[PDB]
CSV table of all heavy atoms in Angstrom, one decimal:
chain,number,residue,atom,x,y,z
A,159,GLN,N,84.0,79.7,136.6
A,159,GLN,CA,85.4,79.9,136.9
A,159,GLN,C,85.5,80.9,138.1
A,159,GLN,O,86.4,80.7,138.9
A,159,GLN,CB,86.2,80.4,135.7
A,159,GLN,CG,86.3,79.4,134.6
A,159,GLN,CD,86.9,78.1,135.0
A,159,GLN,OE1,87.7,78.0,136.0
A,159,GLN,NE2,86.6,77.0,134.3
A,160,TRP,N,84.6,81.9,138.3
A,160,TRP,CA,84.7,82.8,139.4
A,160,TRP,C,84.6,82.1,140.7
A,160,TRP,O,85.2,82.5,141.7
A,160,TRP,CB,83.7,83.9,139.3
A,160,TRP,CG,83.9,85.0,138.3
A,160,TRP,CD1,84.8,85.1,137.4
A,160,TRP,CD2,83.0,86.1,138.2
A,160,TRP,NE1,84.6,86.2,136.6
A,160,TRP,CE2,83.5,86.9,137.1
A,160,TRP,CE3,81.9,86.6,138.9
A,160,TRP,CZ2,83.0,88.1,136.7
A,160,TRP,CZ3,81.3,87.8,138.5
A,160,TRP,CH2,81.9,88.5,137.4
A,161,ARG,N,83.6,81.2,140.8
A,161,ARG,CA,83.2,80.6,142.0
A,161,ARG,C,83.8,79.2,142.3
A,161,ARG,O,83.8,78.7,143.4
A,161,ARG,CB,81.6,80.4,142.1
A,161,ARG,CG,80.8,81.7,142.0
A,161,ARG,CD,81.4,82.9,142.8
A,161,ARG,NE,81.4,82.7,144.2
A,161,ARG,CZ,80.5,83.1,145.1
A,161,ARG,NH1,79.4,83.6,144.7
A,161,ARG,NH2,80.7,82.9,146.4
A,162,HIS,N,84.3,78.5,141.2
A,162,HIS,CA,84.8,77.2,141.2
A,162,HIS,C,86.0,77.0,140.3
A,162,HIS,O,86.1,76.0,139.6
A,162,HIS,CB,83.7,76.1,140.8
A,162,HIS,CG,82.4,76.4,141.5
A,162,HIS,ND1,82.2,76.1,142.8
A,162,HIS,CD2,81.2,76.9,141.0
A,162,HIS,CE1,80.9,76.4,143.2
A,162,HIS,NE2,80.3,76.9,142.1
A,163,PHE,N,86.9,77.9,140.3
A,163,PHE,CA,88.0,77.8,139.3
A,163,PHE,C,88.7,76.5,139.4
A,163,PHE,O,89.1,76.0,140.5
A,163,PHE,CB,89.1,78.9,139.6
A,163,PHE,CG,90.1,79.0,138.5
A,163,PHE,CD1,90.0,79.9,137.4
A,163,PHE,CD2,91.2,78.1,138.5
A,163,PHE,CE1,91.0,79.9,136.4
A,163,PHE,CE2,92.2,78.2,137.5
A,163,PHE,CZ,92.1,79.1,136.4
A,164,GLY,N,88.9,75.8,138.2
A,164,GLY,CA,89.6,74.6,138.1
A,164,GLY,C,88.8,73.3,138.4
A,164,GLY,O,89.3,72.2,138.3
A,165,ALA,N,87.5,73.5,138.8
A,165,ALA,CA,86.7,72.3,139.1
A,165,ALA,C,86.4,71.5,137.8
A,165,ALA,O,86.3,72.1,136.7
A,165,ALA,CB,85.4,72.6,139.8
A,166,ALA,N,86.2,70.2,137.9
A,166,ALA,CA,85.7,69.4,136.7
A,166,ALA,C,84.3,69.7,136.5
A,166,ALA,O,83.4,69.7,137.4
A,166,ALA,CB,86.0,67.9,137.0
A,167,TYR,N,84.0,69.9,135.2
A,167,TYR,CA,82.6,70.3,134.8
A,167,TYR,C,81.8,69.2,134.2
A,167,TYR,O,82.3,68.5,133.3
A,167,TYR,CB,82.7,71.4,133.8
A,167,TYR,CG,81.4,72.1,133.5
A,167,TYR,CD1,80.9,73.0,134.3
A,167,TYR,CD2,80.6,71.6,132.4
A,167,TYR,CE1,79.6,73.6,134.1
A,167,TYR,CE2,79.3,72.2,132.2
A,167,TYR,CZ,78.9,73.2,133.0
A,167,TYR,OH,77.6,73.8,132.8
A,168,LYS,N,80.6,68.9,134.8
A,168,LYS,CA,79.7,67.9,134.2
A,168,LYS,C,78.6,68.6,133.4
A,168,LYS,O,78.6,68.4,132.1
A,168,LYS,CB,79.1,67.1,135.3
A,168,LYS,CG,80.2,66.7,136.4
A,168,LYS,CD,81.3,65.9,135.7
A,168,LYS,CE,82.4,65.6,136.8
A,168,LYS,NZ,81.8,65.5,138.2
A,169,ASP,N,77.7,69.3,134.0
A,169,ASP,CA,76.7,70.1,133.2
A,169,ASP,C,76.1,71.1,134.1
A,169,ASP,O,76.4,71.3,135.3
A,169,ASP,CB,75.7,69.1,132.6
A,169,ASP,CG,74.7,68.5,133.7
A,169,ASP,OD1,74.8,68.9,134.9
A,169,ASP,OD2,74.0,67.6,133.3
A,170,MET,N,75.2,71.9,133.4
A,170,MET,CA,74.6,73.1,134.1
A,170,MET,C,73.7,72.7,135.3
A,170,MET,O,73.4,73.6,136.1
A,170,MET,CB,73.8,73.9,133.1
A,170,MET,CG,72.4,73.4,132.7
A,170,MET,SD,72.1,74.1,131.2
A,170,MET,CE,70.6,73.3,130.7
A,171,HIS,N,73.4,71.4,135.5
A,171,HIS,CA,72.5,71.0,136.6
A,171,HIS,C,73.3,70.5,137.8
A,171,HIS,O,72.8,70.2,138.9
A,171,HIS,CB,71.5,69.9,136.2
A,171,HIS,CG,70.8,70.3,134.9
A,171,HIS,ND1,69.7,71.3,135.0
A,171,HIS,CD2,70.9,69.9,133.7
A,171,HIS,CE1,69.3,71.4,133.7
A,171,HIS,NE2,69.9,70.6,132.9
A,172,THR,N,74.6,70.3,137.6
A,172,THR,CA,75.5,69.7,138.7
A,172,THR,C,75.7,70.7,139.8
A,172,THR,O,75.9,71.9,139.6
A,172,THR,CB,76.8,69.2,138.1
A,172,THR,OG1,76.5,68.4,136.9
A,172,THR,CG2,77.6,68.4,139.1
A,173,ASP,N,75.7,70.2,141.1
A,173,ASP,CA,76.0,71.0,142.3
A,173,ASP,C,77.5,71.0,142.5
A,173,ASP,O,78.1,69.9,142.7
A,173,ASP,CB,75.2,70.4,143.5
A,173,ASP,CG,75.7,71.1,144.8
A,173,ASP,OD1,76.3,72.2,144.8
A,173,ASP,OD2,75.4,70.5,145.9
A,174,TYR,N,78.1,72.2,142.5
A,174,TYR,CA,79.6,72.2,142.6
A,174,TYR,C,80.1,72.8,143.9
A,174,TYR,O,81.3,73.1,144.0
A,174,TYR,CB,80.1,73.1,141.4
A,174,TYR,CG,79.9,72.5,140.1
A,174,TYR,CD1,78.9,73.0,139.2
A,174,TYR,CD2,80.6,71.4,139.6
A,174,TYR,CE1,78.7,72.4,138.0
A,174,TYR,CE2,80.4,70.8,138.4
A,174,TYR,CZ,79.4,71.3,137.6
A,174,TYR,OH,79.2,70.8,136.3
A,175,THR,N,79.2,72.9,144.9
A,175,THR,CA,79.6,73.5,146.2
A,175,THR,C,80.8,72.8,146.7
A,175,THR,O,80.9,71.6,146.8
A,175,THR,CB,78.4,73.3,147.2
A,175,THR,OG1,77.3,74.0,146.8
A,175,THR,CG2,78.9,73.7,148.6
A,176,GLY,N,81.8,73.6,147.0
A,176,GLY,CA,83.1,73.2,147.5
A,176,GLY,C,84.1,72.6,146.5
A,176,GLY,O,85.2,72.1,146.9
A,177,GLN,N,83.8,72.7,145.2
A,177,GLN,CA,84.8,72.3,144.3
A,177,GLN,C,85.4,73.6,143.7
A,177,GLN,O,84.8,74.6,143.6
A,177,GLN,CB,84.2,71.4,143.2
A,177,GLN,CG,83.5,70.2,143.7
A,177,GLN,CD,82.9,69.2,142.7
A,177,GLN,OE1,83.4,69.1,141.5
A,177,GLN,NE2,81.8,68.5,143.0
A,178,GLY,N,86.7,73.4,143.3
A,178,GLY,CA,87.4,74.5,142.7
A,178,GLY,C,87.7,75.7,143.7
A,178,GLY,O,87.4,75.6,144.9
A,179,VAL,N,88.3,76.7,143.2
A,179,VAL,CA,88.6,77.9,144.0
A,179,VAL,C,87.5,78.9,143.8
A,179,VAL,O,87.1,79.3,142.7
A,179,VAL,CB,90.0,78.5,143.5
A,179,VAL,CG1,90.4,79.7,144.5
A,179,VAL,CG2,91.1,77.5,143.5
A,180,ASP,N,87.1,79.4,145.0
A,180,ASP,CA,86.0,80.5,145.0
A,180,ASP,C,86.8,81.8,145.1
A,180,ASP,O,86.9,82.4,146.1
A,180,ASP,CB,85.1,80.3,146.1
A,180,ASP,CG,83.9,81.3,146.1
A,180,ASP,OD1,83.9,82.2,145.2
A,180,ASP,OD2,82.9,81.1,146.8
A,181,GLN,N,87.2,82.4,143.9
A,181,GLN,CA,87.9,83.6,143.8
A,181,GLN,C,87.1,84.8,144.4
A,181,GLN,O,87.7,85.7,145.1
A,181,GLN,CB,88.3,83.9,142.4
A,181,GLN,CG,89.0,82.8,141.7
A,181,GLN,CD,89.3,83.2,140.3
A,181,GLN,OE1,90.3,83.9,140.0
A,181,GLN,NE2,88.5,82.7,139.3
A,182,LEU,N,85.8,84.9,144.1
A,182,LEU,CA,85.0,86.0,144.6
A,182,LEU,C,85.0,86.1,146.1
A,182,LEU,O,85.2,87.1,146.7
A,182,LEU,CB,83.6,85.9,144.0
A,182,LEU,CG,82.6,87.0,144.4
A,182,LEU,CD1,83.2,88.4,144.1
A,182,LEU,CD2,81.3,86.8,143.7
A,183,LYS,N,84.8,84.9,146.8
A,183,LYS,CA,84.9,84.9,148.2
A,183,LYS,C,86.3,85.3,148.7
A,183,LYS,O,86.4,86.0,149.7
A,183,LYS,CB,84.5,83.5,148.7
A,183,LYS,CG,84.6,83.1,150.1
A,183,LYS,CD,84.5,81.6,150.4
A,183,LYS,CE,84.3,81.3,151.9
A,183,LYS,NZ,85.2,82.2,152.8
A,184,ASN,N,87.3,84.8,148.0
A,184,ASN,CA,88.7,85.1,148.4
A,184,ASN,C,89.0,86.6,148.3
A,184,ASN,O,89.6,87.2,149.2
A,184,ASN,CB,89.7,84.3,147.6
A,184,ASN,CG,89.8,82.8,148.0
A,184,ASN,OD1,89.2,82.4,149.0
A,184,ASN,ND2,90.4,82.0,147.2
A,185,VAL,N,88.5,87.3,147.2
A,185,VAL,CA,88.7,88.7,147.1
A,185,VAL,C,88.0,89.5,148.2
A,185,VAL,O,88.5,90.4,148.8
A,185,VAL,CB,88.1,89.1,145.7
A,185,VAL,CG1,87.9,90.6,145.6
A,185,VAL,CG2,89.1,88.7,144.6
A,186,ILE,N,86.7,89.1,148.5
A,186,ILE,CA,85.9,89.8,149.5
A,186,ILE,C,86.5,89.6,150.9
A,186,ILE,O,86.6,90.5,151.7
A,186,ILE,CB,84.5,89.3,149.4
A,186,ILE,CG1,83.7,90.0,148.2
A,186,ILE,CG2,83.7,89.7,150.7
A,186,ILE,CD1,82.5,89.3,147.8
A,187,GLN,N,87.0,88.4,151.2
A,187,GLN,CA,87.7,88.2,152.4
A,187,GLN,C,89.0,89.0,152.6
A,187,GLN,O,89.2,89.6,153.6
A,187,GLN,CB,87.9,86.6,152.6
A,187,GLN,CG,88.8,86.2,153.8
A,187,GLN,CD,88.1,86.4,155.1
A,187,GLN,OE1,88.8,86.4,156.2
A,187,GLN,NE2,86.8,86.6,155.1
A,188,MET,N,89.8,89.0,151.5
A,188,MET,CA,91.0,89.9,151.5
A,188,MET,C,90.7,91.4,151.7
A,188,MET,O,91.4,92.1,152.4
A,188,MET,CB,91.9,89.6,150.3
A,188,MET,CG,93.2,90.3,150.4
A,188,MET,SD,94.3,89.6,151.7
A,188,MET,CE,94.3,87.9,151.2
A,189,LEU,N,89.6,91.8,151.0
A,189,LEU,CA,89.3,93.2,151.1
A,189,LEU,C,88.8,93.6,152.6
A,189,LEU,O,89.1,94.7,153.0
A,189,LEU,CB,88.1,93.6,150.2
A,189,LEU,CG,88.6,93.8,148.7
A,189,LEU,CD1,87.3,93.7,147.8
A,189,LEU,CD2,89.4,95.1,148.5
A,190,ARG,N,88.2,92.6,153.2
A,190,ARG,CA,87.7,92.8,154.6
A,190,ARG,C,88.8,92.8,155.7
A,190,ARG,O,88.6,93.4,156.7
A,190,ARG,CB,86.6,91.8,154.9
A,190,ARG,CG,85.3,92.0,154.3
A,190,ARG,CD,84.4,90.8,154.5
A,190,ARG,NE,83.0,91.2,154.2
A,190,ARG,CZ,82.0,90.3,154.0
A,190,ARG,NH1,82.2,89.0,154.0
A,190,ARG,NH2,80.7,90.7,153.9
A,191,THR,N,89.9,92.1,155.4
A,191,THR,CA,90.9,91.8,156.4
A,191,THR,C,92.3,92.5,156.1
A,191,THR,O,93.0,92.9,157.0
A,191,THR,CB,91.2,90.3,156.6
A,191,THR,OG1,91.5,89.8,155.3
A,191,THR,CG2,89.9,89.7,157.0
A,192,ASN,N,92.7,92.5,154.8
A,192,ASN,CA,94.0,93.0,154.4
A,192,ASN,C,93.8,93.8,153.1
A,192,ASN,O,94.3,93.5,152.0
A,192,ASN,CB,94.9,91.8,154.2
A,192,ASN,CG,96.4,92.3,153.9
A,192,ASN,OD1,97.2,91.5,153.4
A,192,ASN,ND2,96.7,93.5,154.3
A,193,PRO,N,93.2,95.0,153.2
A,193,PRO,CA,92.9,95.7,151.9
A,193,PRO,C,94.0,96.3,151.2
A,193,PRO,O,93.8,96.9,150.1
A,193,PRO,CB,91.9,96.8,152.4
A,193,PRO,CG,92.0,96.9,153.9
A,193,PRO,CD,92.5,95.5,154.3
A,194,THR,N,95.3,96.3,151.7
A,194,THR,CA,96.4,96.7,150.9
A,194,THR,C,97.1,95.6,150.1
A,194,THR,O,98.0,95.9,149.3
A,194,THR,CB,97.5,97.3,151.8
A,194,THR,OG1,98.1,96.2,152.6
A,194,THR,CG2,97.0,98.4,152.8
A,195,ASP,N,96.5,94.4,150.2
A,195,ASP,CA,97.0,93.3,149.4
A,195,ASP,C,97.0,93.6,148.0
A,195,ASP,O,96.1,94.2,147.5
A,195,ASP,CB,96.2,92.0,149.8
A,195,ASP,CG,96.7,90.8,149.1
A,195,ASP,OD1,96.4,90.6,147.9
A,195,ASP,OD2,97.3,89.9,149.8
A,196,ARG,N,98.0,93.1,147.2
A,196,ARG,CA,98.2,93.5,145.8
A,196,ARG,C,97.9,92.3,144.9
A,196,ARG,O,98.3,92.3,143.8
A,196,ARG,CB,99.6,94.0,145.6
A,196,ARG,CG,99.8,95.3,146.3
A,196,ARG,CD,101.2,95.9,145.8
A,196,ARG,NE,102.3,95.1,146.3
A,196,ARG,CZ,103.1,95.5,147.2
A,196,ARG,NH1,103.1,96.7,147.8
A,196,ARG,NH2,104.1,94.7,147.6
A,197,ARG,N,97.2,91.3,145.4
A,197,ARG,CA,96.8,90.1,144.7
A,197,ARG,C,95.2,89.9,144.7
A,197,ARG,O,94.8,88.7,144.5
A,197,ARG,CB,97.4,88.8,145.3
A,197,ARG,CG,98.9,88.8,145.4
A,197,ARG,CD,99.5,89.5,146.6
A,197,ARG,NE,100.9,89.2,146.7
A,197,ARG,CZ,101.4,88.3,147.5
A,197,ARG,NH1,100.7,87.6,148.4
A,197,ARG,NH2,102.7,88.1,147.5
């Protein structure tokens, strides 16, 4: 869920690159560019 929020899940061997929302990347990008953001 942290890296692929909302993606359809098949099993632990499936490659999910680019599926779902990557919240951790979004948090780090916001901290780097707009650190007063409240989301």
Side-chain angles (χ1 to χ4, degrees):
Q159 294 305 332
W160 286 5
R161 302 318 297 265
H162 313 285
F163 188 94
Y167 189 83
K168 317 304 177 27
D169 68 8
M170 76 202 173
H171 310 285
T172 311
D173 172 17
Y174 295 106
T175 296
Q177 303 183 30
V179 183
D180 187 352
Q181 308 179 77
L182 179 55
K183 174 192 190 323
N184 288 348
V185 163
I186 283 162
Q187 171 72 194
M188 188 71 51
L189 283 164
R190 284 170 163 167
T191 58
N192 188 199
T194 69
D195 182 284
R196 293 189 294 250
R197 300 87 167 259

